[PDB]
Symmetry: C3
Subunit: 290 residues, 3 copies
């Protein structure tokens, strides 16, 4: 039993092992050991990739799957997250995947519950499996992290993606750059140098775009002309290194943080990221259940 | 790869083959060609028959199923339908079933995506699997379409069922009649003769009833005494040909377009339609992935 | 085909049999008689234990599962519950599980539908599988019902649990005590003796707590200090018989009807209830389909 909650508490060796496993499974290697066991997907926030890649991963591992929403479950009757987990243990669930609006919802749980918890996202906190498939995608491309320059752009302080990726990339020996509206920068995220998109887009081996976390803002603010100012425009992408890649955890808001024509251009690895997500998540479930 | 979007682009030959395949599947034919493959059901409008007959179909084919609604997916974050399909492709989905409010949502998709799209309904546009199962049911009854007189009643204007059935029935050599409030007739559906229910009910070999598309009208209008005025009353049903049948795409609004006692009367094939739905949908999936 | 609607129509012999079957199931026994059949779970009210224990039970029986709610189905188009059930029969569903807001929704169905119906809860009416859970857990504890004193506390008026449990308990030879706010007492449930919590907690072999049915009240009222007044406080739990147990159909509102520290205390069988729920529900499904 191993939780996957925060990227900062996962060692370099474990990351290295998870990537190898994921790569092998992607290669065709299979395993049935978990056939018949039960996984529960609890998503209290909207999702497509994370949620359904987990379901695919679970079913490829031969597992039965229970899918829980926040509006149809007894959470409507005031049940706590912990009780929901204990309930799921009681009816035979072996592992739980959770996405929740509350930053660090898992701290209370990991010490109390008896089955592995896989964090599919905690508000603006952590997003471990996104980080892992990001790393995998990067390593597949450059076959190393050391000496890489990776720039993360946009709404940083509301991003569990950036918060997971910045520390671990630095830890793996890469240089991390930030950019975007100064208002949206993170003082709790020092693992990167704040520069401008125009500066970073030329020194970056990786250009990671972020969606604006509109649903997470205290107050809605104008974002007219965001693309020109902060986004990856065609002209900006044309100034990227030959070997550089474009990444984005999705969903993309075409015409906002990236030009519509770039999403599926030569240097884009956005959809490749989604492919790797499945195998990364298969690996993570195996790690969780031994 | 073969999409299924509009009935008007389905050849007479393809139709006949789908009906034959459906019959074989109905009579127990099976194979594991599709076992373990993934099907995704994207339903953005309510549904019971189409959605779940598809799920049953997919599972009888031995497929793994993913169910997406639109309020719990990342469409909520602004993701386009196109990006949603590509996302599903990336994670290993082989076929997508889509029901959407936007007429012809699929026109954009079919030229761009790399997996079969099965249209489960586009606003007031087309509803091909309904048409196919309607044809199957009629064919089981008369072993022919040539010379048949089929009347379609009620809210034609907002009916993707009427749109699909009218063109294809006349194309198959049937005579089509329309009835219902003149206000709800469709000038862009000229494949039938407009008459009154009272006339059509004695001339018809098939009486096809439609539900009022309340949720699709620009503004709500009274519908008091609809049954007596426009609907299939007991008195009207008693004037039907001895060998004529009653059909309805469902759900039925008992007391509106049809008298409560008729839904499961001798001449009714309403539930037989739902039965055929599964096999028609199996056949369509087999066609898409051949 | 044996429906399960209300406890009062379930004989003592049928009950003892379901409990023996659930025990054998709980010990690991299974068979293949239901492999590949279809179960449908129609939940129109929120639920965690009942809905997902049913799904688990179903999967453990080797069945395919269809999950329907209220907002995404064609109930939205005005389809009656009856037509919904008949529709499911037509597409190949062998048994239906239903939780609905309308008391006794099932009495118009039992005489009309052609497949077994399993009531997962009808408004403030009955909750048969919960009751069976309770009986099982109670029987596991004391190995008998005769001579037992069982107290049920709180919002009796709006409890389908209390209604199922009260009669069947006294029928099995146990004495039932009632407790809680006098306004929330039920005149349509006279199978117990109203007393104060402080009294019952000392004379009870089983102390069964109920959640306040806030979502079911015609008018909201204050419930300040509910714990200290009507609930199971730490102080009160200390005065329980040595061999007595705490039960609660869940979910619990920690701090309302029970002190936070008692939910998982030595005398609590609340989570054991959830465990037995699966096997009871397996047994009930086996009974429904012969
Ligand atoms: O939604 C974001 O922009 C980033 C990130 N996106 C994803 O995880 C992909 P999805 O919401 O389709 O599961 C996340 O934090 O949820
Ligand atoms: O909704 C109508 O009345 C006709 C038709 N109905 C169906 O296809 C059946 P369902 O909505 O239960 O899947 C449709 O256009 O969606
Ligand atoms: O809800 C209650 O407090 C009692 C009872 N609770 C249960 O059945 C458990 P659940 O709602 O998680 O399935 C019921 O009537 O729904």
């Amino acid at each position: 039993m191993k939780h996957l909650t925060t990227m900062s508490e996962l060692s370099t060796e474990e990351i290295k092992d998870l990537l190898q496993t994921a790569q092998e499974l992607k290669s065709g290697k299979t395993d049935n050991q978990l056939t018949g066991k039960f996984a529960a997907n609890l998503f209290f926030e909207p999702s497509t990739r994370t949620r359904f890649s987990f379901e695919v991963a679970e079913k490829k591992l031969g597992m039965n799957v229970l899918n829980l929403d926040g509006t149809s479950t007894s959470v409507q009757k005031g049940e706590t997250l912990y009780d929901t987990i204990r309930t799921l243990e009681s009816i035979g669930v072996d592992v739980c995947v959770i996405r929740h609006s509350e930053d660090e919802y898992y701290e209370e749980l990991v010490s109390q519950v008896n089955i592995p918890i896989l964090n599919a996202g905690d508000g603006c906190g952590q997003h471990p499996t996104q980080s892992l498939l990001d790393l995998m995608t990067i390593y597949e491309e450059f076959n190393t992290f050391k000496g890489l320059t990776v720039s993360i752009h946009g709404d940083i302080k509301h991003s569990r993606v950036a918060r997971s990726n910045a520390e671990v990339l630095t830890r793996l020996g890469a240089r991390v750059l930030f950019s975007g509206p100064s208002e949206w920068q993170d003082e709790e995220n020092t693992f990167g140098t704040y520069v401008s998109m125009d500066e970073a887009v030329e020194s970056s081996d990786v250009v990671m775009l972020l969606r604006i976390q509109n649903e997470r803002h205290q107050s809605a603010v104008s974002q007219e002309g965001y693309l020109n100012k902060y986004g990856l425009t065609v002209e900006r992408a044309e100034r990227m290194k030959r070997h550089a890649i474009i990444m984005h955890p999705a969903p993309v808001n075409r015409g906002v943080e990236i030009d519509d024509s770039l999403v599926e251009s030569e240097k884009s690895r956005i959809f490749k990221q989604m492919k790797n997500g499945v195998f990364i998540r298969m690996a993570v479930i195996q790690r969780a259940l031994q």
